[PDB]
Write a protein that binds this DNA or RNA. Structure first.
Ligand SMILES: [Mg+2]
Ligand SMILES: [Mg+2]
Ligand SMILES: [Mg+2]
Ligand SMILES: [Mg+2]
Ligand SMILES: [Mg+2]
Ligand SMILES: [Mg+2]
Ligand SMILES: [Mg+2]
Ligand SMILES: [Mg+2]
Ligand SMILES: [Mg+2]
Ligand SMILES: [Mg+2]
Ligand SMILES: [Mg+2]
Ligand SMILES: [Mg+2]
Ligand SMILES: [Mg+2]
Ligand SMILES: [Mg+2]
Ligand SMILES: [Mg+2]
Ligand SMILES: [Mg+2]
Ligand SMILES: [Mg+2]
Ligand SMILES: [Mg+2]
Ligand SMILES: [Mg+2]
Ligand SMILES: [Mg+2]
Ligand SMILES: [Mg+2]
Ligand SMILES: [Mg+2]
Ligand SMILES: [Mg+2]
Ligand SMILES: [Mg+2]
Ligand SMILES: [Mg+2]
Ligand SMILES: [Mg+2]
Ligand SMILES: [Mg+2]
Ligand SMILES: [Mg+2]
Ligand SMILES: [Mg+2]
Ligand SMILES: [Mg+2]
Ligand SMILES: [Mg+2]
Ligand SMILES: [Mg+2]
Ligand SMILES: [Mg+2]
Ligand SMILES: [Mg+2]
Ligand SMILES: [Mg+2]
Ligand SMILES: [Mg+2]
Ligand SMILES: [Mg+2]
Ligand SMILES: [Mg+2]
Ligand SMILES: [Mg+2]
Ligand SMILES: [Mg+2]
Ligand SMILES: [Mg+2]
Ligand SMILES: [Mg+2]
Ligand SMILES: [Mg+2]
Lengths: 97, 41, 134, 204, 242, 178, 87, 121, 26
RNA sequence: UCGCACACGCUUACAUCAGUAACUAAUAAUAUACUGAUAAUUAACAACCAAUAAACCAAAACAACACUAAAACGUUUAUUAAUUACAUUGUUAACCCAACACAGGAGUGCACCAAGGAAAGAUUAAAAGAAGUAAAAGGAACUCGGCAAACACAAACCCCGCCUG
RNA sequence: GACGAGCUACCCAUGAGCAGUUUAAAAGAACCAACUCAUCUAUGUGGCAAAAUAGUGAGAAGACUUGUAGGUAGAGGUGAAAA
RNA sequence: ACCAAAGCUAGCUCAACAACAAAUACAAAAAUACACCAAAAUAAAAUAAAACAUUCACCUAACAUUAAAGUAUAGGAGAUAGAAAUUUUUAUCCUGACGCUAUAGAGAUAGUACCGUAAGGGAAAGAUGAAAGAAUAAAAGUAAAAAAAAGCAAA
């Protein structure tokens, strides 16, 4: 439980730096902009996760069905295995049945 | 976001206040101390 | 030469010559008592007896009577800070002997020719810093 | 030159006793952040007078002995100073010597010869194919510090021994640019005569 | 101990160190003037001493050769001003060892001087006082040294000075060791100052402190001290000289 | 036989000086016969330096004037540079094969594509035992490992990049330039 | 040490033999004849840059064989290193 | 068991014999006696050094030079070009036989051939 | 390296509390 | 009183000089095992070291001659065999396999010492435990059983397997 | 699905050992060493040892011991059956 | 007072975009002699069905995405399995991080030591400062300070 003896340099953060000032800027783009582009397109991320949501099982099964054949051998394997495990666990376990 | 308990130190010390005057190994080691302190209160 | 491809010999083939020879040599003071007629060489691994002979005769004009060759094994024992082994490299030794009765001796290479302050504290000072007058 | 991936420079040469003693084979210490400087943006050589903008000794001017590019340091002789003992034995602490603490290149600016002021060096290309250091403040060209070498040998004062080739012989061009190799050449000019030819060989 | 085992440990390989070691000072004091053995009795007569000093200054060829190289190398230089600055460098040096401020103590005193006056004293309490200079500071001689390697010239000005000082050295436990603070003792110091010439910062420094041969034995120390005879092994017999 | 030692006059002396190593250029000027000689004039010297060295070791004495050895070495090395040079261009002009040894790109059992250095045999290859039992080709299953290799390799690049990128953030936040 | 000759140590049964067992009526050698092996031909020696050796090769041989030849005889007569020799 | 250390003639049994990489000079004989071929022993070709001036080192103040690695083309210019323009200007140029300029059609005639590379060094 | 300032800082108060027990101030 | 050598197997643990406060030794002293520097075993012993036809029914066993289980081993004739100093390689050890500097596992030839080696760090002289020697009278009364031990080392009868394995 | 017969079981090549005594006998005969097994007891039980030590024991020219080197592989091998 | 304790870096995670040269398959790293070479046959079971016999998604393939739809269907018609027609989809640009901070993060300072005859398994450890070309005293455990008729140790 021995704890840090010397004060760290206080991290100074300008909340006024570019990215933070400009946060959430185009959020209303569809509405204010006579909808053409959806808020979705403001999402920069992993191919299969854009404008979508799900629990682990759905995520995984999705990554598979989308990028599956572009994955490395080993990751792929671990993915199929995680899938199986999850199948078994969500369907076949719980308190609530 | 891996998060840990920094302050575990005080958590212990707040028990150990009361464990000071005990005889034996009861007055330091947190396990034994806890129990002793319960019986005491 | 060494590390070189040598041309396959078959019958009626031209004599093989090597114009710039790749080998090298060391003349070393024998660790042991030996007869005067003998001189000792550390040579590279790929060097045959006949080779050391010809090499010696031709480049240095030394009259070789005979040659022996043995291989000293370098220690694989000593360990690195990671406990990987260190290897002192294995090397080939060759003893030579001189033709006309020439007696050799290894030259001593180092003839030895070249080209007080007591600040200890005063016993009777008692440790006082004597730099100070008064 | 012998170096591990994580290394620390103590002013001491990589191949030395003091270097094996400071950072032995089994130490890797914390990284030292060093502002990246491309070799072409580096304005400091050894031997030029530079004003030191920082330290207990500041505003002063000194000559540059040696540069450590790796950790980005300069060395001004006997200017930045701390005191160390060299001679040591049981009864004797001998020889207190002034030694130079190295300086980062943020604390040192190049001094232009004319007005002996500090300046901002800037690399420029003139009209002759030349690359020189021009002052932001003074608008001059600053020289480069032509210096001795680690040998101690000045070429102008020299005498050739037994095994030294004189300037003359070495610049002598004996070359005859023709289609023969060293081998045909040297056998031909040694007078060695050969007749028989190699049998057909196969190659896989 | 001077010892080297050449049987195993080889020889530390001979290096060319990329930076030639840069010395502000040279340890040696080249030529030591040895004062007259009657300088105690000639110190009560003002115009005897002052006359002999000024005379031996003007008369010496070496002295004025050296003051010539100093003057020709360093403009705005005067020998009649110097014993003033010199007597000042002292009162700054010792006042430094009182307070134990070593940062100023480097600016004043030389490379050879520092290790000595600082060393053996550094764990004790030093309290020293300057009251009278009975005879104003006298410049004895000047010596230049030519290093043909560096072109570096080292001027050394010798100042013989008479003084009145009160020194009290306490040991690290708070108890007195050497001498009272209440005795303004009379001292005769033969002092040596040094300057580097080619140096652009041209500092004037205290180099060394020399004691003449007949100089008075110093104050008796307080604590008794034991000088041991030689340590004997069992079979070695002792022998007593007459 | 003393050709393995310095002039007896030089033995007990610490610093024994000597000249510079040979620039490539300085050698480019010599004819072929004379490089051929310089090989040996350098050779004998090399052997002396080696000898002197080993003895310095044996004697618990630091070796007099070390750099000699470095220097000779380079020149030997340098001489070599010029010799192959003069063959290498030559054959390019005559033959035009950039490689002096026959050889071919081949594919070994481990799915690596290798540069096969050739060899000399008294007989044709289809009459050769040992050659014929070497297999240059990939079998079917190996194709799996091939991919893994790629992938394995592909990660290392992948996370090398990702490290260097990081080193640029850190510095730029440690050193606010401009 | 003789090893530098070269010479080699190899141990096995140590025999003292005259060419005939002790039982023989002929205890005494007259002469021997040693034909020289092929290695030791003259020509080979002059090829090897070996001059005087041609003579020495002979010498050596005698000093060996003859010695043994003699010694055997002595040993056969009951003589040895501590009985020395009468005749 | 030692996995890591290399396999040498010194580790195995009697029967295991592996040369350290010296080159083979011969073949086995009839009697079992070993046979050497005078033509398989490398013969060093050494000039007389006494007659000439060259040294293992050079003067320090002696100049370095502009560094030009030799290119095929430079060579072609020094040797082949002058003679070539000489005989095209004369008009006696014969693109058919280039042998007078030093070109060799195929290498199997000559002693040291470049491409199969007959010679050690 | 993202730590508790809470940890360090709160610890400092102990540190000085002990500084106050081992040398009580004048 | 397990000695010398070789094969196998080990790899520098061998050699010389210097060091050991600590690290190896289950302690020390000092050093064949810890440290460093420097050296070193040299081929005549050993490894490498021809084919294709053709005659030959007939054992080794001190081999006279036989035994029954029918027994490994090469001579010569002919056909060609690059012909030519010196090829290459192994040669240290107190050693190996058992996690150990293990009372154990380790093939062959010679030896029974001419070789190798030490059972006890220093005392004391309790109980209990281990190994050994001796014991009056008695002689299996012990005990599942004469197990163990013995100045004994003999006879007999049974059940079950036939037998050596 | 790979990996293992360097232990051990069984072969297959290929080497090597068995002294003295008794016997008309080299007879799966006797006596008794080396050698090979492992009866019975006591030690030993984090041992010297993950099966040993000391005594004591059976075999000891044979279905004998043993060296090096190959061979059979798990749904299988191998076995004078004890799974 | 010992033993100890603290540093913030080494790198990692997820995601976007797109040193020749010799020698090496003789017992690998041994230049050189007469041959042979090469080849293929469904994945299975653990497990679900509360047992187990038919059956038990993913496990190979590419095909994505929004739907049609958990529908048509197939199923010891149980467990579960599960389509298509037909529909949807705007450019690049604009990289990072409500990811880890030395038991975490990769096994990794390395597939290294070490462990296996082998396939195979498989570690642990870094920290002073510009400069060593300058020599907190807070875990258990102990020590400073051995114990005095009585007994969940405290109240
Ligand atoms: Mg979830
Ligand atoms: Mg040889
Ligand atoms: Mg040999
Ligand atoms: Mg292994
Ligand atoms: Mg072998
Ligand atoms: Mg062997
Ligand atoms: Mg052997
Ligand atoms: Mg955090
Ligand atoms: Mg071992
Ligand atoms: Mg010890
Ligand atoms: Mg031996
Ligand atoms: Mg005892
Ligand atoms: Mg007893
Ligand atoms: Mg008893
Ligand atoms: Mg009795
Ligand atoms: Mg009874
Ligand atoms: Mg009874
Ligand atoms: Mg009964
Ligand atoms: Mg009994
Ligand atoms: Mg008895
Ligand atoms: Mg019955
Ligand atoms: Mg039976
Ligand atoms: Mg029997
Ligand atoms: Mg077997
Ligand atoms: Mg018998
Ligand atoms: Mg029998
Ligand atoms: Mg007994
Ligand atoms: Mg019996
Ligand atoms: Mg019987
Ligand atoms: Mg096998
Ligand atoms: Mg198998
Ligand atoms: Mg059986
Ligand atoms: Mg049964
Ligand atoms: Mg049963
Ligand atoms: Mg390789
Ligand atoms: Mg089943
Ligand atoms: Mg089930
Ligand atoms: Mg269930
Ligand atoms: Mg299935
Ligand atoms: Mg990016
Ligand atoms: Mg880790
Ligand atoms: Mg504590
Ligand atoms: Mg009570």
């Amino acid at each position: 439980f021995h704890v840090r003896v010397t004060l760290p340099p206080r991290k100074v953060v300008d909340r006024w730096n570019e990215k933070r000032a400009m946060f959430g800027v185009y959020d209303n783009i569809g509405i204010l902009g006579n909808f053409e582009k959806h808020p979705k397109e403001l999402i920069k991320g992993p191919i299969w996760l854009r404008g979508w949501k799900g629990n682990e099982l759905q995520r995984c099964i999705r990554k598979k069905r989308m990028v599956g054949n572009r994955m490395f051998i080993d990751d792929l394997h671990n993915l199929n295995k995680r899938i199986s495990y999850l199948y078994k666990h969500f369907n076949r376990h719980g308190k609530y049945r | 976001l891996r998060s840990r308990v920094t302050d575990r130190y005080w958590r212990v010390q707040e028990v150990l206040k009361h464990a000071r005057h005990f005889r034996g190994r009861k007055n330091r080691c947190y396990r034994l101390a806890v129990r002793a302190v319960t019986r005491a209160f | 030469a060494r590390n070189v491809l040598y041309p396959l010999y078959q019958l009626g083939n031209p004599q093989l010559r090597v114009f710039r020879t790749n080998f090298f040599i060391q003349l070393v003071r024998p660790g042991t008592a030996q007869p005067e007629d003998t001189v000792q060489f550390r040579i590279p691994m790929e060097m045959t007896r006949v080779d050391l002979r010809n090499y010696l005769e031709r480049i240095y004009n030394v009259p070789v009577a005979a040659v022996r060759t043995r291989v000293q094994y370098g220690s694989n024992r000593r360990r690195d800070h990671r406990n990987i082994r260190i290897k002192k490299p294995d090397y080939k030794v060759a003893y030579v002997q001189l033709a006309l009765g020439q007696t050799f001796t290894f030259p001593d290479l180092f003839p030895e020719r070249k080209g007080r302050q007591k600040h200890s504290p005063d016993p009777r000072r008692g440790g006082v810093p004597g730099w100070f007058g008064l | 030159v012998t170096l591990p991936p994580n290394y620390r420079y103590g002013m001491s040469r990589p191949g030395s006793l003091s270097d094996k003693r400071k950072n032995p084979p089994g130490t890797r210490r914390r990284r030292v952040p060093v502002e990246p400087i491309s070799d072409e943006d580096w304005h400091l050589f050894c031997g030029d007078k530079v004003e030191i903008l920082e330290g207990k000794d500041a505003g002063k001017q000194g000559k540059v002995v040696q540069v450590i590019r790796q950790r980005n340091w300069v060395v001004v002789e006997g200017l930045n100073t701390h005191y160390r003992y060299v001679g040591k034995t049981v009864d004797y602490r001998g020889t207190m010597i002034p030694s130079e603490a190295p300086l980062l290149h943020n604390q040192v600016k190049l001094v232009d010869p004319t007005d002996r002021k500090p300046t901002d060096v800037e690399w420029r290309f003139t009209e002759a194919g030349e690359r020189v250091r021009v002052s932001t403040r003074s608008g001059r060209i600053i020289p480069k510090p032509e210096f001795p070498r680690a040998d101690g040998i000045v070429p102008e004062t020299w005498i050739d021994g037994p095994k030294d080739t004189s300037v003359e012989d070495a610049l002598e061009k004996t070359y005859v640019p023709r289609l023969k190799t060293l081998e045909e050449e040297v056998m031909e000019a040694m007078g060695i005569q050969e007749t028989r030819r190699h049998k057909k060989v196969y190659w896989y | 101990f001077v010892e080297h085992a050449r049987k195993a440990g080889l020889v530390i390989p001979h290096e060319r160190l990329e930076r030639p070691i840069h010395l502000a000072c040279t340890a040696g004091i080249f030529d030591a003037y040895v004062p007259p053995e009657g300088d105690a009795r000639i110190s009560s007569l003002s115009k005897e001493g002052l006359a002999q000093r000024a005379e031996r200054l003007k008369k010496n060829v070496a002295s004025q050769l050296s003051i010539r190289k100093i003057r020709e190398s360093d403009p705005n230089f005067k020998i009649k001003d110097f014993p003033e600055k010199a007597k000042d460098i002292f009162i700054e040096a010792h006042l430094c060892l009182n307070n134990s401020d070593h940062d100023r103590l480097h600016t004043l005193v030389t490379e050879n001087c520092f290790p000595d006056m600082v060393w053996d004293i550094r764990y004790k309490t030093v309290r020293w006082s300057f009251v009278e200079s009975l005879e104003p500071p006298q410049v004895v001689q000047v010596r230049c040294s030519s290093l043909m390697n560096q072109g570096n010239i080292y001027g050394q000005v010798t100042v013989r000075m008479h003084t009145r000082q009160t020194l009290a050295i306490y040991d690290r436990f708070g108890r007195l060791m050497y001498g009272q603070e209440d005795v303004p003792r009379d001292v005769l110091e033969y002092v040596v100052f040094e300057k580097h010439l080619v140096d652009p910062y041209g500092s004037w420094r205290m180099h060394g402190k020399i004691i003449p041969p007949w100089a008075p034995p110093k104050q008796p120390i307080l604590k008794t001290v034991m000088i041991p005879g030689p340590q004997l092994k069992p079979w070695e017999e002792f022998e007593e000289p007459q | 036989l003393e050709e393995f030692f310095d002039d007896p006059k030089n033995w007990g002396e610490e610093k024994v000086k000597s000249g510079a190593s040979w620039t490539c250029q300085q050698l480019r000027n010599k004819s072929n016969e004379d490089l051929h000689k310089l090989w040996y004039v350098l050779l004998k010297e090399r052997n002396m330096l080696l000898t002197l060295e080993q003895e310095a070791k044996r004697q618990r004495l630091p070796m007099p004037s070390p750099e000699r050895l470095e220097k000779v070495v380079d020149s030997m090395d340098a001489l070599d540079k010029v010799v192959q040079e003069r063959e290498d261009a030559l054959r390019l002009l005559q033959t035009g094969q950039e490689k002096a040894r026959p050889g071919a790109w081949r594919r070994d059992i481990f799915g690596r594509i290798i540069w096969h250095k050739f060899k000399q045999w008294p007989i044709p290859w289809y009459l050769n035992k040992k050659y014929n039992r070497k297999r240059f080709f990939a079998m079917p299953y190996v194709e799996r490992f091939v991919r893994m290799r790629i992938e394995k390799q592909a990660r290392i690049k992948a996370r090398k990049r990702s490290l260097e990128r990081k080193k640029e953030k850190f510095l730029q936040e440690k050193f606010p330039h401009l | 040490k003789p090893d530098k000759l070269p010479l080699f140590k190899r141990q096995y049964e140590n025999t003292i033999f005259i060419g005939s067992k002790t039982a023989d009526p002929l205890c005494y050698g007259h002469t021997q004849f040693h034909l020289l092996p092929d290695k030791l031909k003259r020509e080979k020696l002059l090829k090897q840059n070996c001059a005087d050796q041609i003579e020495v090769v002979f010498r050596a041989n005698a000093i060996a064989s003859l010695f043994a030849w003699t010694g055997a005889q002595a040993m056969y007569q009951g003589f040895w290193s501590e009985a020395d020799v009468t005749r | 068991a030692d996995r890591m250390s290399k396999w040498t003639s010194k580790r195995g049994p009697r029967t295991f014999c592996k040369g350290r990489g010296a080159k083979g000079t011969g073949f086995h004989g009839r009697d079992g006696k070993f046979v050497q071929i005078k033509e398989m022993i490398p013969e060093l070709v050494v000039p007389e050094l006494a007659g000439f001036k060259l040294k293992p080192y050079v003067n320090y103040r002696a100049p370095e030079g502009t560094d030009t690695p030799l290119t095929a083309k430079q060579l072609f210019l020094e040797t082949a070009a002058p003679a070539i323009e000489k005989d095209f200007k004369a008009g006696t140029f014969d693109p058919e036989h280039l042998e007078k300029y030093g070109f060799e059609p195929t290498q199997e005639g000559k002693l040291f051939q470049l491409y199969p590379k007959n010679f050690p060094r | 390296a993202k730590k508790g300032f809470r940890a360090a800082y709160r610890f400092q108060k102990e540190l000085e509390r002990w500084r106050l027990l081992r040398c009580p101030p004048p």
